[PDB]
Amino acid sequence: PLRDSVKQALKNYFAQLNGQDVNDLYELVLAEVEQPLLDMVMQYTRGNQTRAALMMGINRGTLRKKLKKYGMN
Amino acid sequence: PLRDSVKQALKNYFAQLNGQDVNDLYELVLAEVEQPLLDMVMQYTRGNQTRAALMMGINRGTLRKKLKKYGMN
């Protein structure tokens, strides 16, 4: 499943640190999962935002802030 | 990269729906994703919550509210 892919992505990520700084990991993983989600959900509701917001549990303004930050709408 | 794995996961999941009403998909995906991440940063940081919060760019407070939310500590 998916949580096992996030684990492997983080192992292979931490190895590539070779002892230096990260001060941004949550943002960097959220973008990486948030942006495929938004895109698959928009395709699934045929570009309908309210149906997408309802499917996702967030309201329509949240969908548009999220959308706007991945340069999506 | 990881954005493609999240894509497939959602493909596979939407094929499973039919008359299934989804209303919590942002939180559902997020749960599958912040549990392996938090876990993986605590293993990395040997349970030091200050280094894991800094590493993630999260306040230590927010780190502990997410640990507790998930039943990890």
Architecture overview:
Chains A, B: One of its GO terms (cellular component) is invertasome. Chains A, B: Residues 1-19 are annotated as: Required for the stimulation of HIN-mediated recombination. Chains A, B: Residues 49-68 bind DNA. 2 copies of one chain form a homodimer. By secondary structure, chain A is mainly alpha-helical. The first copy, chain A, has a single domain (1-73), classed as Orthogonal Bundle (Arc Repressor Mutant, subunit A), CATH 1.10.10.60. Chain A is 71% helix and 0% strand. Chain A has 4 helices and no strands. Chain A has helices at residues 2-15, 25-44, 49-56, 60-69. The longest helix of chain A has 20 residues, at 25-44. Chain A starts with a helix and ends with a helix. Chains A and B meet through helix 1, helix 2 and helix 3 of A and helix 1, helix 2 and helix 3 of B.
Tell me briefly what this model is:
Chains A, B: It comes from Escherichia coli (strain K12). Two copies of one chain form a homodimer. The first copy, chain A, is mainly α and 73 residues long.
CATH topology category name of chain A: Arc Repressor Mutant, subunit A
Helix/strand structural class of chain A: mainly alpha
Q: Given this structure, which CATH class of chain A is correct?
A: Mainly Alpha
Record field, number of beta strands of chain A: 0
Rounded to an integer, what's the Rg of chain A over CA atoms?
Answer: 15 Å
Shape, principal axes of CA atoms of chain A:
elongated
Give the % helix of chain A: over 70%
Instruction: Output the number of helix runs of chain A.
Output: 4
Can you tell me the CATH superfamily of chain A? Homeodomain-like
Main beta sheet strand tally, sense and closure of chain A: none
Region (Required for the stimulation of HIN-mediated recombination) (chains A, B): 1-19
Organism (chains A, B): Escherichia coli (strain K12)
GO biological process, one term (chains A, B): provirus excision
Protein name (chains A, B): DNA-binding protein Fis
